[model samples]
Target: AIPAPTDLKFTQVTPTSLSAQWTPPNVQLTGYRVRVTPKEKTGPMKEINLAPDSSSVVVSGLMVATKYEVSVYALKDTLTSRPAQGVVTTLENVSPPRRARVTDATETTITISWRTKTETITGFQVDAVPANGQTPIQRTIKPDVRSYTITGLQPGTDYKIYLYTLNDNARSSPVVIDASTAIDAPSNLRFLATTPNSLLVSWQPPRARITGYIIKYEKPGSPPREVVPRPRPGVTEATITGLEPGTEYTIYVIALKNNQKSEPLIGRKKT
Candidate 1:
């Protein structure tokens, strides 16, 4: 009978693969036999035969986070030695989603999407965290959901978006995206008063952080005139003077933030 192998050990254990190594007995031998038995009792046993000088073997297609008993036998022709045995556990699965991105952004909303990793998952989580340390907004989605829209965000503000996959027993690593919302657009444009050479326009300011407002008026085939009024936090009305009487002027009111203009509100008036 040959001597049993010694110093059996395992390394580089992953969700589906592992490597096993040992010291062969100090004697001439034919080969070695490797056998693995899952502790879960329902899985089938696996076996591998190595050459006489082989000291290591790699096994694949194993279950995640499972413990298995490994045994190595020294073989001499037809004789078998007592088995040198050890136990190893596979690592947890952590396949995260990929390709996270911001698909669209408006004044108070952002749309984001992601691609899936090839693995099993139960659900997903989306988090929109403000850059200024405000409370984070979170949403839970189904496993099949690939896109989400986050609303009620501040305009022209930066946010860190985190997408996570909820696995069977753990949360996968996060996929991150940094994004910013567009500036808010002004609303409710109308005339407060009208005169032959002057027109007063009032509008509701956008609900975003803004620097000021720009009022642009143009007559047909005429150079546009622009006015930058003294803007306060609550200033919502401005008067356009020196207008040509009995001429139709196309007026536009736009909000500005960080030199970025919002969609203009258009109005036509005869001055």
Candidate 2:
């Protein structure tokens, strides 16, 4: 009789398959036999025969999230060695959500929505993987939920978002989508100085790519005034003229990038 195959183990456990490996017996062998039995005794055992050169074999068509006992034996002609035994549990099989979309976006937030028609799951999970190698944003949603909003993200950055269905502490394959947050509004809008007919306004640049800035000033009875600031990097400043002294004007500072525009930073000041 040949010696038993040694150091039996299993790996790469999936929802429907397991990869089994063992050390070949020291003595010459004609072949090997593999047997798999369900731990719960709900299914019949399965057998597989392999040539002598084989050391690893993948067993497929198993049930989802099930445990199994596996045995390996070295065979020479009709004689067989004692079995080498191992056990493994299959991974859970869950249906993934579909039709995932990025519903909305702001400088600091992105909203995602999805659909799942047939899967009965406990809940859902959303992961926002940043393209710039930042920490991922994760969120867990309630059962039957359809949408999620990821917050506190950087502006004008790309993200690959994954949506998964959760059932019995197991996660399904992800439904993925890509999105980018909108450019941020300019900040620190304030007055540098004011004169009888003009107001000098300046603001900190937004943390995003920009082409230039647009300044709009409006009062109740007069036509709105528009000014295109000089396109330059770093901090920006603009002087608004032809204003009535001591009258309040609603001022907006808007950042432009190609065809996209940042949220307006608004201020009310008297000139």
Candidate 3:
């Protein structure tokens, strides 16, 4: 009988699959046998048969998050030769969320952004869980945009954001992100402060096409009191008025394009 193959190799082990390759023995062999089993000593086992000329094989339908032991042996005349074995683990089919960041933040709202998995994913899900609250706010995003924003959150609160990719059949795993809302308006907001409430706000020209700006304000402990929608092109700032004297307020400014608002710049005023 011929000696079995020497120096077998395995590669590309994923949550669901792996590939194996080997060098044939120096002597002639009738066939080859491959066997696989879980690392935890499970009773069930898997086997495959290969022709003598075959040099490679791909194994599929394996469980994710599991380590498997594989062995290959030569067969001749209804007899079996000595076996060579290797071990590998498959990856978790689900991917962690990508590009997670706090895109926009204001006293009353926040926008969360993240990228989806590149693998064959059907949809994406986002969970905005307030640091102080027990229940989390969840949203499902379509496959088109790899990003999403969360709005209408309380200002100055820390929030945990979890993201997940939905595979073709809606299966998923956990991906966690952390972010916080801004207590004051964004710094570096170009505004001419004229008597506190009455100011001329301006910003640098945006690189992307934009339609207008969204200017918002709120008094202490109050929901965002007002929103000013200005439809002006190529202008960075707008004039704001009607603020009360001696009151502390937060101002949020955002650029808008095609009805979508950019991340916010926060400011504060003592009227």
Candidate 4:
């Protein structure tokens, strides 16, 4: 008499891979087969054969951001046993970054901004190349800021900005923008006083989705400092605290969105 297949199981599955394992039938098993289909029945079943002596199989090269059903079957010489099934889902593809723009401009400085193409973006790369040169300027930025400013530029010169959204192994198409710096120094530079350990920093939101604020500070003869405020959606004022009293501090504020940060608008205060 033929025996039933036992201990059938799905071992692992990822956005692009699947693995299955099972024990042989209790009696006279000849081989095994694997059948897979979409959980919602949106497609046809896919079948694969397994060697009689092998206990596992791996399936790769699957589509990202999809769900599937997997099953195992045991073959006993001439007949196949009842099938066992499970469900799995694939990881989503990296999305294209959005809202690439020039957030701030100055005499020899330029700030670029962009949003993540998807939540899977691990970080980003900013390429600021001279329009007349082949060696592009490159910098890796974190997801905490949706904007970045390039400094040390030649005043009154044109530049080509290339923003690339990045993940562990994927990158979105480059978003390009053109910018030119002012011929003179920035105006209306002033400092405001609030508290010994805190200061109120304000700025205009860039022409993109504004998610929150970043406050960076440093004391005289000390290392620079930074702080990320809670996401506030629309408000712009950020209060910076935790400072040494009567110390001279330099502060800067930047707006953050999709995963980019804006340029630093520098200010000074006594904490």
Candidate 5:
């Protein structure tokens, strides 16, 4: 019979494995054998035999965030002594949200999908930032939900999106996704008031946000008379002056946001 090893304790632990240290018996022994058994799984025990000179070892290839019972014994060739036991519960695992991807996008909406870790978790937090210096947005989702759609996005603008794991304590590392929205055409552009050589037009902005407007007016059949006026931010209406009196001309208005232009809001009238 041999005495049990002294002070067998775990030195380090990770999501999947652990390292243990112990003091061998003063009496000379041939070798040592260690065995690990999972507390949750019913299977064959994992075992390793180490040289007599060794006092510490790291065990690998274990399951993440799991519990196990580990045992150590003094050995002599085919002979084995009574086992000294130690039980360990591995560290809690932090796994990234897997396969995060964009499913669809429109001028004012975006859809995405992903899978959370198998471990019990609180929820997911989505952070979105516009590329055009607009205010950022954030949202939280339920734990059972894996897919989401974000709305009220700007047309023709790139958005930076981040997905994070959440628990009662705090958020985990994030997964990033970049999405761009399609253009939204403006509507209902008509003259509010007009004179022989001047006109005033008032209309609502497009469904998508705009930084400026493109206004063009030209004779119906004349080339080179069309014009794209310099953009004015937050201008919903325009005033056109110095036009031919009682002569018919074509007018076009397009909303602009982040260098992207909407389909023309077209009209024709006589000065």
Candidate 6:
């Protein structure tokens, strides 16, 4: 004969599994029986059974985010003990969306797509952070949704995108992808002054958002391109110093946006 188990409790709870423990009482048990009843269903449709040889059992194949009533029993010979019961709710089973890809980019918008690991997710969200101080754009969609279009962006711009998934009201960690849009070539570049050891340069802003401008110069006869500091915000002129007097050099001015650079404008001066 079997005696009822006592102190039935949940030891571990996960999105799709529950591990349980109970105290075997009054008899040497041959085995144990477990019944998991879904909270939403009634009668026999709600019950799932498990028979194991130990006082503890791990129940799997459960639904995500669903609650269940778990009952445990002791058995010896042909007799079964009355159930010791407990309740548990599964966690939300959410991971970051996968294969996030940039599908398209235009002057004012970008299109992105992704795939989900499971259909059980509740929703998804995307945050598009712009490079040039524009407000971050946010988008949300349901579980069946798998793509988004972020708009109001500048031409030749850069943006960092964050993707989040929702399952059973829990948000998962983000999947990120960097994106940018295209723009026309920058224009209006020229030399402002020619000095013995330096050259002054200026340019106009491109028809897009800009972080700054990059100025590069090569001494035409002796060396490769050299770097110049980016111009400050709202400023558009730079001077390259320490040049060889009476040497001919070609200066290159390029507009800087996100990670993309504008087409180079070349000018020549003798320093």
Quickly count the clashes in candidate 3: 8
Listed per model in order, the count of residue pairs whose N, CA or C atoms clash below 3 Å is: 0, 0, 8, 14, 0, 0
TM-score of 5: 0.48
lDDT of 3 by residue, 29-141 (tens): 67889998888875456799999887878988888767899998888767777887889877667665676777776655667666755666667788888877557778887
Tens digits of per-residue lDDT, candidate 4, 40-149, equal 75555578887777678787766665688777877866787787667777655655568778889876689877766347668787778865554667888886778677
Q: For model 6, how big is the CA root-mean-square deviation?
A: 9.0
Residues 1-271, candidate 1: write the lDDT tens digits: 7889989888667667789888889999899888888998957788989899988889888877889998899999999999999888876775778888899998889999888867777898888998766788898889888888998898877899888887755566678999988877788889989999999998998977788878898999998888756455567999899988998999888888768888888999887
Candidate 6 displacement at residue 221 in angstroms:
20
- Rank the models by TM-score, top first: 2, 1, 5, 6, 3, 4
Clashes of 5: 0
In candidate 6, which residue ranges exceed 4 Å CA deviation?
Answer: 1-62, 68-96, 105-108, 117-123, 129-136, 142-146, 153-160, 165-173, 180-202, 205-253, 257-260, 263-271
Please give, for residues 1-271, the per-residue lDDT of candidate 2 as tens digits. Answer: 5788888877677677889888898888899889989999877678999998889999999888788998888889889999999888877777788888899998889998888867668999888998877899998899777878898998877899988888876677799999999878889889988997988889989987677777889987888778755445564888888888889898888887766778889998876
**Over the full model, what C-alpha lDDT does candidate 6 score relative to the true structure?**
0.77
**Against the true structure, candidate 3 has what lDDT?**
0.70
Predicted structure 4: lDDT? 0.68
Reference-based TM-score of each model: 0.64, 0.71, 0.38, 0.36, 0.48, 0.42
Over 1-271, each residue of candidate 6 has an lDDT whose tens digit, in order, gives 4568988778878777888887768666777667887788733323444454476888887887787888887767688888888888878787788899999988788998999776577888888888888889888877887778887777787799998997766677788899888764557777888789988787776777677767778875666565556675477678888889998888777776655777677878887
RMSD of each: 9.4, 4.7, 12.8, 16.4, 9.3, 9.0
Of 5 and 6, the candidate ranking higher by lDDT: 5
Query: Tens-digit lDDT track for model 5 on 97-183?
Result: 999999998878889899865877778889889898998778888888888988777777789999987765445678999998876
Residue-level error in angstroms, candidate 4, position 240: 50
